[PDB]
Amino acid sequence: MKHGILVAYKPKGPTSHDVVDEVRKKLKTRKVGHGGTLDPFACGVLIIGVNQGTRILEFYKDLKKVYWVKMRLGLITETFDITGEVVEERECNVTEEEIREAIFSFVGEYDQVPPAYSAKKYKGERLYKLAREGKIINLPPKRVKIFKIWDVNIEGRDVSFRVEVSPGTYIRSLCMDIGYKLGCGATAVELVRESVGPHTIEESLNVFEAAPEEIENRIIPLEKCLEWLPRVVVHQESTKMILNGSQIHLEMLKEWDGFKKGEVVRVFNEEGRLLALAEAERNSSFLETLRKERVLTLRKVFNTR
RNA sequence: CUGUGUUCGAUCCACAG
RNA sequence: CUGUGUUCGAUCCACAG
RNA sequence: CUGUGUUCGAUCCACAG
C-alpha cells in the first residue's frame, strides 16, 4: 500500500475529481484526493494525493502556479470561460500597444474579485451551484499577486501569455479584468497549468492513458515530498515515542537544518522514515542547553503507513 | 457532523470545530 | 507499582462521522 | 464538534495504599 504524491496531468474535458476517480480505479485505493482544482476547460498539472499522502495536500495550496492562457477579447460569458453561455461578443477596437500596456499593468499585486463560478462557499453552498441556479455572486476582492507575465503573443482579439501567480488567483478573473482595462471584456479560451510549485507538466502523468503499474511507480513517497521544507532527524530511539504523539524536545534529536520559528519541518527517523511534520517553537541555533526540551510542536504524525 | 478551503459539477479530498 | 479520580481529572496522537 | 483506541494508543495531574 503506497503513500504519497502523484503529479497527474489533466487533459481538457474531465473535472478534477474525474482524475481522482481514475486513480482510485486504477490503484484500487479508496483514499485519494487532489491538491488544487483545475477547471474542466483547462489542462495541466493537478496534484494527487494517495493514502497518507492526502494528508500533505494542504501544503500545495500555498505554492505558486504558472499558467499559459489564451483569451479572446470582446467576448464575455457567464463563467468567464469558453464553456459559458455567451453574454456579449463585441469587436474590441484596440491597438497591440494598449493591449500590451493593460496586460502589464496587472503585474505586481492587486485586488481580484473571484468568478461567480467558483468553489467558494456562501452560507454552506458552493458558488458554482448557486450560479447554475442563476444566483451570480460577487464576493469581496482578494489581495492577489501576479509575479510576472511573459511570452505574450497577439493577433486579432486572440491574446495569449504565461503568468506566474500567487495562491488564490483566478486566471479567468485576470482575463476579464485586463479586458475591462481595455474596456471591452475578455474571456479565457484555453488554459494550461504548466506548474504547481516545483512540479512541472513535463513530469506530469496522464492517468487516463496510463496503466495502473506506471501510475503506481509514479507516486512520490512521503520521505520525498515537501522537499522544500527543512529536514530534521531524531534518535532512532525516539521514533516510537513520536509515533505515539509525544511532542519533540531537545533531548530527542540529532541533526537539523536551521529553521525560523513557526516554520513547518519534517521529522525524520534517522533510518529514513518520515515520522511527522512539526512546527518550530524557536530558531534552530539555540544549542544553548546549559539546563532544561520543547522544540518542535507536532502538526501531523504518520501513524500506520 | 457542521463550517471553510482548493483556478467550477469534492456529497467523495484537506483543514478547523 | 496498586486504587480512586467525584457528572467519565488534564492533555497529545490516530481513526471514524 | 460527536465518538472510538489490548492498564491509554501516549503523556500528565490530584488523592490515597
Nucleic acid strand D: bases within 7 A of protein CB: 9-11
Cβ of A249 near strand C (under 7 Å)? The reply is no
CA separation for the pair A224, A254 (Å, rounded): 20
Radius of gyration of chain A (CA): 23
Distance of alpha carbon A96 from its chain centroid, rounded? 32
> In Å, how far are A3, A80, A88, A172 from A99, measured between CA atoms?
47, 19, 19, 17
Of A14, A11, A7, A67, the residue nearest A35 (C-alpha):
A7
Residues near A236 by Cβ (< 8 Å), separated by ≥ 6? A269, A270, A271
Resolution rounded to one decimal, in angstroms: 2.1
- Spell out a b/e string for A107-125, using b for 16 or more CB atoms within 10 Å of the CB, else e: eeebebebbbbbeeeeeee
> In Å, how far are A133, A136, A144 from A126, measured between CA atoms?
11, 12, 21
Nucleotide lying nearest to A61, CA to C1' measure = B6
Nucleotide lying nearest to A54, CA to C1' measure = B13
A39 is catalytic: yes
Other CB atoms within 10 Å distance of the CB of residue A168 = 13
Query: β-strand A248-249 against A264-268: which pairing, if any?
Result: unpaired
Secondary structure of chain A in HEC code, one letter for each residue: CCCEEEEEEECCCCCHHHHHHHHHHHHCCCCEEECCCCCCCCEEEEEEEEHHHHHHHHHHCCCCEEEEEEEEECEEECCCECCCCEEEECCCCCCHHHHHHHHHCCCEEEEECCCCCCCCEECCEEHHHHHHCCCCCCCCCEEEEEEEEEEEEEECCEEEEEEEECCCCCHHHHHHHHHHHCCCCEEEEEEEEEEECCEEHHHCECCCCCCHHHHHHHCEEHHHCCCCCCEEECCCCCHHHHCCCCCEECCCCCCECCCCCCCEEEEECCCCCEEEEEEECCCCCCCCCCCCCEEEEEEEECCCC
Contact A123, A213 (CB under 8 A): no
CA separation for the pair A166, A298 (Å, rounded): 28
Residue ranges of domains in chain A, CATH in brackets: 1-221 (3.30.2350.10), 222-305 (2.30.130.10)
Length, in residues, of chain A: 305
Residues near A244 by Cβ (< 8 Å), separated by ≥ 6? none
Experimental method of this PDB entry: X-ray
From the CA of A241, how many Å to the C1' of D7? 18
Q: Which residues pair with A138 in a beta bridge?
A: none
Contact A278, A248 (CB under 8 A): yes
Residue A128's Cβ-side half-sphere holds a number of Cα atoms within 13 Å equal to: 9
In chain A, residues 170 through 209 whose Cβ sits under 7 angstroms from any atom of nucleic acid strand C: none
